[PDB]
Amino acid sequence: MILKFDHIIHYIDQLDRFSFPGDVIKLHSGGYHHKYGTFNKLGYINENYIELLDVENNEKLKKMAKTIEGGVAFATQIVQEKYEQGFKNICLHTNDIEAVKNKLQSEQVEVVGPIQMERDTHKKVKWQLLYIMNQDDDEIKPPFFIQWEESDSMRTKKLQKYFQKQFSIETVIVKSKNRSQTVSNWLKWFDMDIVEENDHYTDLILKNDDIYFRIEDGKVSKYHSVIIKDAQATSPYSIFIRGAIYRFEPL
Ligand SMILES: [Cl-]
DSSP states (O other): OOOEEEEEEEEOTTGGGOOOGGGSSOOEEEEEETTTTEEEEEEEOSSSEEEEEEESOHHHHHHHTTSTTTTTOTTTHHHHTTTOOEEEEEEEEOSOHHHHHHHHHTTTOOEEEEEEEEEOOOOOEEEEEEEEOOSSOOSSOOOEEEEESSOTTHHHHHHTTTOOTTEEEEEEEEEETTHHHHHHHHHHHHOOEEEEEOSSEEEEEOTTOOOEEEEEEOSSOEEEEEEEEETTOSSOEEEEETTEEEEEEEO
16 A cells, blocks of 8 residues: 655644744645635645644534544544644545555554545645554554545645745654554554664554655653755754744755
8 A cells, every 4th residue: 555644734723913023834725625614824835745634614614623523533533632633643645545544444444534524725626535543552643644635746846836946745753652653553553664663763654655654752742843955054053942943954
């Protein structure tokens, strides 16, 4: 199964007022997720993006969080994680979500979906989501899967106008209070390869993508930071904003 990094979710309260410092990453207004009462703004990088997410209809999201789908859904994590701002999850791209569902189901991993999804464009974009429902404990919310209705790469020719090619996502850093468990689960669910193992962290990689996934020991369990290679940077820097860390590195 060919998996690639699709997007990272950052929960930001009062997202309509929000912009990145010095407009380092340009943003484009997204749409509204009718099922959940959430809306987004998108930071297109290169064949992947940053999804900034907020809640417009709180009563709808709270209702939805109490359902079975709500126990796993990306939007309802806002409620379940007590409205704490920051990176919520990562989403992995597939061209065959049914093959992913069958592969996980053949390993007895309880899945939710495929869930049909849509949002209107400012001029309709469709996709399906599939979630992992771990019966055991999760320190880290499991990454979820996406299959865009639009073909690959029919999506790359439509969004190339928005891609900011000076940037390239390199690494996603996850802090876990149970690294051993997080690694074991991610190797099982995502068919990842082991890159590095030491007393502090484990680096993982998808078989069909160049992004590193660093799971490091921490006093917290969370999606912590993203490392973005910046072609226009001469010196590294980090931006802490609304509970998330965006690290920028030259080359
Ligand atoms: Cl975990």
